[PDB]
Design a protein around this nucleic acid. Structure first.
Ligand SMILES: O=c1[nH]c(=O)n([C@H]2C[C@H](O)[C@@H](COP(=O)(O)OP(=O)(O)OP(=O)(O)O)O2)cc1F
Ligand SMILES: [Ca+2]
Length: 427
DNA sequence: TGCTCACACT
DNA sequence: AGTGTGAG
């Protein structure tokens, strides 16, 4: 009976990352309710990142800025840079690289998004445990750490509660056994306090972390005590944790599959999966999903932290909603050329920085009237980092989609253009 | 929201 | 390949 305690895994997550990047650059905005927007001319801008001050008012991602100002009249905004008619994330990718390089000094990380990485600390934990003689862990080593499900048993202030929970954990900690999985988690989190202490010292950014035994738990745990805090979710907190945890809060159960787990099975919380056999779960959801759900609701997951701090694709997309859909052939050239131009800037940087070339160009369009994120994906070869050739070749492989009999028109009008560089080879 | 990115299925 | 899902 194996219990998924073999690894120590952490998930770190930059608290409102884009906001922090803007607040480091423009100090005026620090410690105020503020958000980052892109494209101001439509309803003040779509909001893509919201500080915690601003969230206390209810400002959320994907509002329009004009609606966020209704909820938060003193809300400060920063706008994303625009390059060649489109939002340009280069400042945030560069802060992201800053943080990931720091994290890498500690343990191998899997970049998961521009603002989070997973951390396999199985190996760093063993080494620390031998430098540590066997001496107890001081509560002073975990000054921003919450123990989930503690305190329990026979203080009205938040910091008060945390200390009581950490004292209880440490008081019962079995430091003489260099193999108790709870002790490894504790050491895992000491390493995460230091790793987080150095992000802040060396970039000024604050972040939250989750320390558990796999990636799903660490990600849940990270969310439990935001902002600027870390949470140990031990194997033993799982039954109480999952007992009232909605299915949709576990990673990858937030969409259609989770909804079917809810409907088909007639349950609400992750804990309720444990009453079904593995073959039962497989019969509703397939061999892989039933297996995955059977182990997960018992706190067991095996997805490895992959040693991958660089993306597999470089992508450049722009939407054209509404009357702004592209209706003329020479409109479609121009944006393609705009898209191929930013793609080229970024490809050359990536060759120079990271020693690889992309070999396949993926083009994708949206048609006025279709339903889905994409309406069509097509590819060709990517042999030169040249905007004019990349955009020419991208046109070539989409020109037949033009249903219009006219040459100078384009029917149906295009609602999105997308270029993606993939298939990387060492350079 | 829009602009990304990883991945499973076929 | 090309499509669909899930996420930040
Ligand atoms: O829908 C989105 N839009 C959207 O621009 N981004 C962008 C902007 C954001 O700063 C950055 C971070 O992604 P996160 O979803 O993890 O959120 P954070 O801002 O870092 O902090 P917290 O999770 O609120 O504590 O991606 C994510 C989306 F998911
Ligand atoms: Ca986050």
């Amino acid at each position: 009976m194996a219990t998924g305690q073999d690894r120590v895994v952490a998930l770190v997550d930059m608290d409102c990352f884009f906001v922090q990047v803007e607040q480091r650059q423009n100090p005026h905005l620090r410690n105020k309710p503020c958000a980052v927007v892109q494209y101001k001319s439509w309803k003040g801008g779509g909001i893509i990142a919201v500080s915690y001050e601003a969230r206390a008012f209810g400002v959320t991602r994907s509002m329009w800025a004009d609606d966020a100002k209704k909820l938060c009249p003193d809300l400060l905004l920063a706008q994303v840079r625009e390059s060649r008619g489109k939002a340009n994330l280069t400042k945030y990718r560069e802060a992201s690289v800053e943080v990931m390089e720091i994290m890498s000094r500690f343990a191998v990380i899997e970049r998961a998004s521009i603002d989070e990485a997973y951390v396999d600390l199985t190996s760093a934990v063993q080494e620390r445990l031998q430098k540590l003689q066997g001496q107890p862990i001081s509560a002073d080593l975990l000054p921003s750490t919450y123990i989930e499900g503690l305190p329990q048993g026979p203080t009205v202030q938040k910091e008060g509660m945390r200390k009581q929970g950490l004292f209880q954990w440490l008081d019962s900690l079995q430091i003489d056994n260099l193999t108790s999985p709870d002790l490894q988690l504790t050491v895992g989190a000491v390493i995460v306090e230091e790793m987080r202490a150095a992000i802040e010292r060396e970039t000024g950014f604050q972040c939250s972390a989750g320390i558990s035994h796999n990636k799903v738990l660490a990600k849940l745990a990270c969310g439990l005590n935001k902002p600027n805090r870390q949470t140990l979710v031990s194997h033993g907190s799982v039954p109480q944790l999952f007992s009232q945890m909605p299915i949709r809060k576990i990673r990858s159960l937030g969409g259609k599959l989770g909804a079917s787990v809810i409907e088909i099975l007639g349950i609400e919380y992750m804990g309720e999966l444990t009453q079904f056999t593995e073959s039962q779960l497989q019969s509703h959801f397939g061999e892989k999903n039933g297996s995955w759900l059977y182990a997960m609701c018992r706190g067991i997951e095996h997805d490895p932290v992959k040693p991958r701090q660089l993306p597999k694709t470089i992508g450049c997309s722009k939407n054209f909603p509404g009357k702004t859909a592209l209706a003329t052939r020479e409109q479609v050239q121009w944006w393609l050329l705009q898209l191929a131009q930013e793609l080229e800037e970024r490809l050359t940087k990536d060759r120079n920085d990271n020693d690889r070339v992309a070999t396949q160009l993926v083009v994708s369009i949206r048609v006025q009237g279709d339903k889905r994120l994409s309406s069509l994906r097509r590819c060709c070869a990517l042999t030169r980092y040249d905007a004019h050739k990349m955009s020419h070749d991208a046109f070539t492989v989409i020109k037949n989609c033009n249903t219009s009999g006219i040459q100078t028109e384009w029917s149906p009008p295009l609602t999105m253009l997308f270029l993606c560089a993939t298939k990387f080879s060492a350079s």
